[PDB]
Amino acid sequence: TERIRNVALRSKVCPAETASELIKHGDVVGTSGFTGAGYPKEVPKALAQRMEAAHDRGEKYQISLITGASTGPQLDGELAKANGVYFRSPFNTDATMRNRINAGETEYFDNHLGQVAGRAVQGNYGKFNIALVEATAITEDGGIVPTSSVGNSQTFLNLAEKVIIEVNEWQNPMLEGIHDIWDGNVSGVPTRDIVPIVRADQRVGGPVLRVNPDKIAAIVRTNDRDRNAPFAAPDETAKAIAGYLLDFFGHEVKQNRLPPSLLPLQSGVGNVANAVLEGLKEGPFENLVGYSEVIQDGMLAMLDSGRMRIASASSFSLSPEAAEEINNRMDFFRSKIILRQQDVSNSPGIIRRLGCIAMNGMIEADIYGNVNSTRVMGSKMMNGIGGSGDFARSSYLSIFLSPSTAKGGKISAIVPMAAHVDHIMQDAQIFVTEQGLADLRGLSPVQRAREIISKCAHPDYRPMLQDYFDRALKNSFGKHTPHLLTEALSWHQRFIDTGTMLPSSLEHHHHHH
Amino acid sequence: TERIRNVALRSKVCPAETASELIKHGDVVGTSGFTGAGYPKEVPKALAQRMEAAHDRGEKYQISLITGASTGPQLDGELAKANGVYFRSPFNTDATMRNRINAGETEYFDNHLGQVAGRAVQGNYGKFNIALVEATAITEDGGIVPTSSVGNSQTFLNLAEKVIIEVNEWQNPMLEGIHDIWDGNVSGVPTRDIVPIVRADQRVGGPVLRVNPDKIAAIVRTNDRDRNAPFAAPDETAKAIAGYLLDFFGHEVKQNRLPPSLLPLQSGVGNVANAVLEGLKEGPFENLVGYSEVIQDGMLAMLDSGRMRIASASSFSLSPEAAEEINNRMDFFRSKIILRQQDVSNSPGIIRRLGCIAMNGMIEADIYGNVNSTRVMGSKMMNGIGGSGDFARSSYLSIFLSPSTAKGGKISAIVPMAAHVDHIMQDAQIFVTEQGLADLRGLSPVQRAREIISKCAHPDYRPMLQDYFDRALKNSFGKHTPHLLTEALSWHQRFIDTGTMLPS
Ligand SMILES: [Cl-]
Ligand SMILES: [Cl-]
Ligand SMILES: [Cl-]
Ligand SMILES: [Cl-]
């Protein structure tokens, strides 16, 4: 059946190559795309080819690329291969784009996801020349039905001088109705509207993105798949982490500090999250609710069983198998899922009101429970802060989960001092590794260190951590948050120099004695 | 006139010593008090005396002390002298207590001020045994009229098993009516209520704290003074900082990025804030609105001149001179000021909705614009994060302001790497020192560094910072946020070793 139900707009249909010509060197381009879902695909591929051709002739051709969050090979990948992006925000997971960022070839700033729309409207990224948005369909009155994510698309459509729509027949038609797009002032000029969400299953808007049809310069018919990353199977480390967390939830319930239905749940993606979702499926809890950035594989089963009653997100983050499950049963799942603008899914006011439980990953934390989510050795970007700050700070409970080591034991995830900080002590209450769980509620920094070192640190590193702390307590400038500035970042430099944080027995180390 | 207007509650009046005996070793005690205003005074003194005697006899006697924010010598001071506090939260500025904290003798955690109530209700500090709250009066129906701050007092009254009220005759009776206490669920069990505030001047509650009178175990008649802010005027450094900020506001308005009346304003206390407020009083922006934590001298002056229409806060921080002024004209100022619960003044949902402009101080920032608000050399507590994070992250514009150096030039306020981080890059858009203003909007870390180093750093330190950055760009593990880990914290260590960040 016809996906473009507004007859007039059919006249704007053209090839991807032609559409890409609308995008000029220097342009600021806002696109759909969040957790590898719903980003434009064919126009960026064509743009990349033309960029490379220009470069080969000594002609400059680069854009500023602002997204919802991560995209995929067709967008971040192709443009990065072409060296076609001078600035990128707010969140990337493509390896080639990451390499451009870490080489300084692409300037990058990872804004809190829930804040991106507001900062865009304030003009922080400049004037938007293009909005490039993937659609499932265009309605009779010209509404744009998003695909597998909402992200920042409404904001980009509002701001952009010209609009290009990719109508993707790969995307299931029955996605129409799953989205909730509000015309309220969430990220516009103050005073903003109250975002009146008081339950995770509440709809406040309608099913379509709105745009003046006169701004639509091109529509491209496509048929291409999202990036449905392979299911990250939980390993025994992930299962141990989930076990400690689930035991903790169980205890909170028995102490009446959580209801038996817990509270609305947010989790980052990865095998730890997968392990947690598997544990919840088998746990004693009931009537669970998701209020998160993403819909993950493990939710589909819980929505199917009835263990989870509703899941709110801005995007899908599904494996190929889960994507197939939801496509064959979209009629059912559409009734169980709400996809929102990311400035709503990640709204601090709503997150706090609902009392979300935030569960996020990390690169490392220091002994005082400051968390690095982004910068390896302090300087090399991984993905970005994403919505981890939106959720950590606003949550009823902020939980960080990670293996206690990385790189086959050569890195400790618990260090004397984080090489970069994304989440301060005040934004992290519970830490979980395969070694155990640290409950830091109501503790001073020194008390936090005692819990993190004892419960979370790996046996290969705990004595080294204890030694640093003990000597810091004796010698630190102040004793409120003891540090030895001469060696605080020395484990990181040891890794840089030698490829491991484990000390050689060929030199003196205080913990060896 | 009689301050205890509920006739029956008069029967609960007793001496401070007797009231202090209600407080036991190990107790969690929640008190009034914020920015040196409205904390209990006489019961803590009596408690401290008894604690010292107990200790001398070999008896343990310590409490957990949870407040709104800072208190004064009668509370933090006396209890610290007595070594009587095992845990303290969320914000202290008393020197004796600070010394206890920095010696490891009192455990301390500086929670975001707007979150303290919610964390207390969740049980993070444990069961509240006592609420000790200063009052201006008790009304005929048993309402508790707060004094010079609201803070967390309503939450502590809700939570505590037993309540002690200090009714202080020193406090102006005309304070009654200035407070706005909401009966809704801001910091209680989820799902919380929507707070219907959509304008800074909107009152949504009543003038009194509510408490079950059966929980009132003692009422103590007191007569003692709050602390005052300094009178001292801002110097040329603070004035230069204010100048850059005011010029910035002007340009924003001209570019239609701010309304002619700006947006609701928040500022921390200090010389720089005073300079900004003084600048605003004689400035071109009319019909200003304050939505802040505190009412300070300059804030008062603008309400007077009409340049500011209304000021919302949780507390007062006034010089003796300004206190005299407001106390002589309370009827007027009462109509211009709203004192709210700190979980409302500091609510991120409200702050973002209103689009506040946040203006905060700092100990230091690094070249990438991460800000340390709290910990000198990374380990020695100054005051605490306070509400700076509540506001910085939620604000329409987050601005940080500071002299570019301290200790007669021996410390640089701009460093290669902050020794402790309270505000991440994402939470700081604008930096101002007496050297100039760095606008970091839309910039990558390397771009941020160029601006901070060139605009904000003192000339004595700028070449050193540029040298660090240039060498980091060449030799850093990654180039997205270049660092040299061997020397990132070396300026701090140099200060520790030699008393200055300047090389020999
Ligand atoms: Cl809201
Ligand atoms: Cl806490
Ligand atoms: Cl609200
Ligand atoms: Cl920005």
Swiss-Prot record, chain A:
Pfam families the UniProt entry points to: AcetylCoA_hyd_C (PF13336), AcetylCoA_hydro (PF02550)
Pathway: Metabolic intermediate biosynthesis; acetyl-CoA biosynthesis
Annotated protein name in UniProt: Succinyl-CoA:acetate CoA-transferase
Control of this protein's activity: Subject to competitive inhibition by coenzyme A (CoA).
E.C. code: 2.8.3.18
Reaction(s) the record says it catalyses: succinyl-CoA + acetate = succinate + acetyl-CoA
GO terms for biological process, alphabetical: acetate catabolic process; acetyl-CoA biosynthetic process from acetate; succinyl-CoA catabolic process
Subunit text: Homodimer.
Keywords: Transferase
Reported consequences of knocking out the gene: Cells cannot grow on acetate and have lost the resistance to high levels of acetate, a characteristic of wild-type A.aceti.
Chain positions recorded as CoA binding sites: 268-272, 363, 383, 387, 407
